[PDB]
């Protein structure tokens, strides 16, 4: 009693911790599994891609909305999206399903979030930096982009549209 409990507790604590670490290492491999798949595309590109935020919609891939969509592979389509003060460019984005859409998103002003509702595309859009995410829509329709990062008083109203193509 009291000293009997002490060795009982410190003995199931050792068995609890072993179990704890085993359970976490199973998460690690079930996270290490999602990294080798096609689902690991929505991870932002690691290599830095600097841009000026004040000459983005004047010169370069984000100047002209029309050239937003560009076939760059047999089934690859590099969209150039521009997250700005309460809005998105192009609106709407239009791309075929079943195709590998490689978005390259930035901002001319403040930080924005690029959340495509129903997908795994959730990336932070940084002024002067390109946010590069790879995705493959396997369902048709109108995908809604929400700006999940507070970007000012019109932040709750900043929504997008990606009409994947049926």
């Amino acid at each position: 009693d009291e000293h009997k409990a002490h060795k009982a507790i410190l003995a199931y604590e050792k068995g609890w911790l072993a179990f704890s670490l085993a359970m976490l290492f199973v998460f690690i491999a079930l996270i290490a599994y999602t990294l080798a798949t096609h689902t690991a595309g929505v991870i932002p590109a690691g290599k830095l891609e600097r841009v000026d935020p004040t000459t983005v919609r004047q010169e370069g891939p984000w100047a002209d909305p029309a050239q937003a969509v560009v076939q760059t592979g047999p089934n690859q389509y590099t969209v150039y999206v521009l997250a700005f003060a309460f809005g998105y460019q192009p609106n709407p984005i239009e791309v075929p399903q079943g195709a590998e859409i490689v978005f390259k998103i930035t901002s001319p002003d403040v930080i924005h979030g690029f959340h495509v509702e129903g997908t795994n595309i959730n990336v932070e859009v940084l002024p002067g930096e390109v946010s590069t995410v790879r995705y493959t829509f396997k369902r048709p329709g109108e995908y809604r982009i929400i700006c999940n990062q507070y970007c000012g008083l019109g932040h709750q109203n900043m929504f997008g549209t990606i009409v994947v193509k049926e």
Partner: protein, 554 residues
Amino acid sequence: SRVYEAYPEKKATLYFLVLGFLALIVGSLFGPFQALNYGNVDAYPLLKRLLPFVQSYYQGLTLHGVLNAIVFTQLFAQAIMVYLPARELNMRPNMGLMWLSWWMAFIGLVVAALPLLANEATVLYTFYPPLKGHWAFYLGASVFVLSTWVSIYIVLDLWRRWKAANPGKVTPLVTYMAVVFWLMWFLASLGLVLEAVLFLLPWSFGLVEGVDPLVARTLFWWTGHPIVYFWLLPAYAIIYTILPKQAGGKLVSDPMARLAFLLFLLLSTPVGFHHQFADPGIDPTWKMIHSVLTLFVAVPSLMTAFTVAASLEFAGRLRGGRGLFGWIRALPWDNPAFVAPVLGLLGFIPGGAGGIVNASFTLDYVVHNTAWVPGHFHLQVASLVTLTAMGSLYWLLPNLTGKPISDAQRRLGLAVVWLWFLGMMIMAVGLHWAGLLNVPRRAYIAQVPDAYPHAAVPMVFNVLAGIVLLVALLLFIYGLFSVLLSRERKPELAEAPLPFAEVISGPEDRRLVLAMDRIGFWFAVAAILVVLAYGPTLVQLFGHLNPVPGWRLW
């Protein structure tokens, strides 16, 4: 008071406390409105008629964030993690400094309050650039935070002093915790110190025109995560060494607690990338390495789960605890300072579940910036930390002022406690649901009522809670001020020794605790981990700095 002349630390502590709670009150008023807003009702006109200086939803969120999560917590920690180790050691902290730390905290708050109250600072408690705030916010906050540095000294001073009067003796438990704590916080605070010193302060004073927003939010999170543990550990401190006495039992192991804290000192700072999963320009690999280390920093809280349950179990048994669940019914559910924290620990289970998910890298992309995250943390900070804070008034307040607590206040608190917990539960459910329902957080969505129709049913829970917790806050205030406003003074209970727990120790303990007491080694160990995890990244970033101009978007 010969009480304060003999224990001047008591006074300093008290000031910290009140200031903190004052801050908690004010910051909490916006909480019901933000809950109603998340129930799809827009009560903000009423708020504005009552509080004229309020200009929007976002200014009240900033004020909510800053006063509650930042001011309140820091002050409390500064009060707990200095006073407790003092009294345990029965040593007086350097009172010059201690009083210095308070003023800094006070002054700092004042200066930073003004531009917040003047809508000059509608940036949120995270103050991400390029959103630009008034200089006196960034100067205010800096001071206020630096106040902790003083607190770190003070505590270390005590520690060095005691080791001298007890050569070869293991650092006493609480003091060990406080020590690791503050060291841990020192290491953590760098990130933020840098940001402010290198970018934010010269930016707001006019000296530069631009600041890289990535390197800005990188340094911020270096600090941004560990600070949550800067909020937590003072409550942990209390739970380990004070709650078991309250429950009528003992701490079941001194080593375990030492270990928990030791792990936090090691694994708290180098995990900030978990807040930056959705960020560009940060290698995915380093996002995996940080995701691994974050699941590791949950190990300490796993250990605590058991150790505290067992002690509480042990306690219930000494009380006349029956079978598998008897002990629970044996506990002192009549005593607030017991009830408050125990409730928090309950809600923590969902909270910590929420955090393990957010930490799993890829899984973050499901809930990031959604109201699932406010749900996650209100269980953590707004529940466990605050309740703990609240309930600890019942032994602490008396221990400082001498003012006894009537049975009526004692039941008043029990009500405040339950309502607060319950309401916290409702909202927890109401913000988790709508979160998975893609409702973003930080949103005035009652000005756009038809935006989110699929969150019909959760919007209701949020409403409910709003009300629940509006009541609970009110009663608190009344309960609070009733106590502080009475002129009953029993100068004997002020001098009553703090109700610390006794500690069941074992044979093995000695060599293990002896290892853990190798603090200077563990510190540099912890210092190395941060360099290894941030070092690589931060080098490239400072090689390729791309500062952009500031914006006012309110």
